[PDB]
Design a protein around this nucleic acid. Structure first.
Lengths: 122, 37, 106, 136
RNA sequence: GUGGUAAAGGAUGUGGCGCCGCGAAGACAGCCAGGAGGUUGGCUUAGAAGCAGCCAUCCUUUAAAGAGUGCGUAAUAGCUC
RNA sequence: AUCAACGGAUAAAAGUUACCCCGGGGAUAACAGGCUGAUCUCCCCCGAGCGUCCACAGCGGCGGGGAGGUUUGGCACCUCGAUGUCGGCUCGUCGCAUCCUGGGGCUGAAGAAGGUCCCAAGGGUUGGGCUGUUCGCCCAUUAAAGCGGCACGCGAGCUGG
RNA sequence: CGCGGGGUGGAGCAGCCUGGUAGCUCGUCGGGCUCAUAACCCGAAGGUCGUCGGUUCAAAUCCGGCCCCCGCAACCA
């Protein structure tokens, strides 16, 4: 769930399904990369022509594969770790992202539009 | 502007100050912090 | 209006200078001239890129081995101090280019 | 600078007390029991002087440059027999008469004298005409 | 809280000391009205005809006689002194 | 007779040791201590001449005074019957002349932004990139990302390049 | 911060260290060989000897410290 640099799944606008991470985005000390958060990271894997290409980027969480809790104690695990991508402060580059409904995601409520864009199966 | 030193009546006419033991000068202009203290 | 130029160890530098009219020579000197420092330094020569506007200059804009033979010899220190000191005279000269333009233009 | 064509290469030392005297020209200064003063500083006086006297009010300077000093070479260690050179000073002990006549008149000097007074590494004092002297 | 290891230079610190402004036909103020009456620039005149960058070296009043210290630009005002 | 390393051991004479030994001694270093404070680190002082009207917002040329004692050393009496001499992690802690947060001053201050100047340690004050490195460059930064103390904190707790 | 090496006609060094005196080379001015140029034939020309302040009846010189260039030096700490 938490990460400095690591292998973490991008599943977004990279030309391949991975991004290397860099770290947590806000509190100096924190270590832990909690969900519902934006992050610094980079792809390591390849692309088909595409656009985003190699370089550096700042962007956000999806899932965890390491224990959430809800205030209503809803719970939901997943042996996989995709996470969101963003341009600028906020807006989402790719207008495409396959993914499901899910819970914690919108709850930061800084980026409501996304929710529509990744609703589906698998 | 608490200068360390000097102080020589630079808002032209100016009052020598004696307070808290500390000794200064103020005149008509704030742009005259002659506190060598 | 004249033609206020600039200086930078090399010559001609990027591509500034226009027409310094009404003391406009130094007017912007301490401004544009002091272009921070080209953001990039490149080497430890410390070239002095002045402003050859049209004078008569105007504007006014290294390893650490020395301390290792510690605790003594204000002698041998000097010995190894001259070694590199000679490079500077043979660097800035041979080290052509030394022009890191295309920075910010400010 | 102000020295030349030396008899030697290095004086010895001393400093205890001496004697200068009356002003030449009814404007001047004087001090206390000075340590030696470097020529730049010595020349700095007139240097400090020139700007202020109507930025032109002509004045005779004063005392002549003297003694050698050096850190041998630099800061290695003693090994030198005692040599090499750079800077020069003045014999300075009873509070020597400073020379300050001009005709440039009044305070303009008198504070330049304070300029001078604030200048130079010894507390001083301020003088002018007083009580003559006479010589054969 | 000076005794209590520091210079420089500041210092209407304070003390007493000698040297010089008491003008009781009475002052320096602190005050209050005046705070000049022909007291207005030939060189900027972009205005200075004190009160930006350019002279002050003779009379009128005597209330005093600011050649003008002042804040600043359309001169100027307008407040100090 | 230069026996002139000139009161001369011979009449005729080199080095090298990190393969060394063995004696003795703090009557000579290295790290360290301390010493004074030279150079450094910092703070004032004078005020040029600047910086739309400016000497003293901003600065500071030419200068001076220092203080302070971490680097440079000079020193060299503690000592050679044992002062184990680099960084690193550990856990600290004083100190502030502050680096972020206090509170002001001041603006060449519309204000926010800032700059600059006082007064004050409660805290707090990152992870990596790569080399023996502190240091330094850099990458994202994040309220911020400070010096320096204390035998260059720290071998009877190590690391060990 | 020492040393030891020396600074010379346009350039090149000879020549000096052994007090009263600089020479050898091209290149060089003008001149011969030529369709033109080279070749090749000739002339003449021209030197505070890095400074300096001194010894010296006199100093390129002897001698001294300042000025550039060469090389040796710069230990285990």
């Amino acid at each position: 769930m938490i990460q400095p640099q690591t292998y973490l799944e991008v599943a977004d606008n990279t030309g391949a399904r991975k991004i290397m991470c860099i770290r947590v985005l806000k509190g100096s000390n924190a270590k832990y990369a909690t969900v519902g958060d934006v992050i610094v990271a980079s792809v390591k894997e390849a692309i088909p022509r595409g656009a985003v290409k190699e370089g550096d980027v700042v962007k956000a969480v999806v899932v965890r594969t390491k224990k959430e809790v809800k205030r209503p104690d809803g719970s939901a695990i997943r042996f996989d770790d995709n996470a969101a991508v963003i341009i600028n402060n906020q807006l989402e580059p790719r207008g495409t992202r396959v993914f499901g409904p899910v819970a914690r995601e919108l709850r930061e409520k800084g980026f409501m539009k996304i929710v529509s864009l990744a609703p589906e199966v698998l | 502007m608490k200068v360390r030193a000097s102080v020589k009546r630079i808002c032209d006419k100016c009052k020598v100050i004696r307070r808290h033991g500390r000794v200064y000068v103020i005149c008509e202009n704030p742009k005259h912090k002659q506190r060598q203290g | 209006l004249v033609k206020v130029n600039v200086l930078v160890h090399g010559e001609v530098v990027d591509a500034l200078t226009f027409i310094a009219h009404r003391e406009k020579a130094y007017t912007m000197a301490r401004a544009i001239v002091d272009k921070l420092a080209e953001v990039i330094p490149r080497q430890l020569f410390e070239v002095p890129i002045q402003a050859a506007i049209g004078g008569k200059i105007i504007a006014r804009a290294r390893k650490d081995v020395l301390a290792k033979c510690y605790g003594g010899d204000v002698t041998r220190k000097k010995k190894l101090l001259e070694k590199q000191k000679e490079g500077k005279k043979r660097l800035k000269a041979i080290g052509k280019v030394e022009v890191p333009q295309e920075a910010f233009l400010a | 600078r102000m020295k030349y064509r030396k008899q030697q290469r290095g004086r010895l030392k001393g400093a205890t007390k001496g004697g200068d005297y009356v002003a030449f020209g009814d404007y001047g200064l004087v001090a206390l029991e000075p340590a030696w003063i470097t020529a730049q500083q010595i020349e700095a006086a007139r240097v400090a002087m020139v700007r202020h006297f109507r930025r032109g009010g002509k004045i005779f300077i004063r005392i002549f440059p003297d003694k050698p000093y050096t850190k041998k070479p630099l800061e290695v260690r003693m090994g030198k027999g005692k040599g090499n050179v750079e800077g020069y000073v003045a014999v300075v002990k009873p509070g020597r008469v400073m020379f300050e006549v001009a005709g440039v008149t009044e305070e303009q000097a008198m504070e330049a004298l304070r300029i001078a007074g604030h200048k130079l590494p010894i507390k001083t004092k301020i003088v002018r005409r007083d009580a003559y002297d006479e010589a054969q």
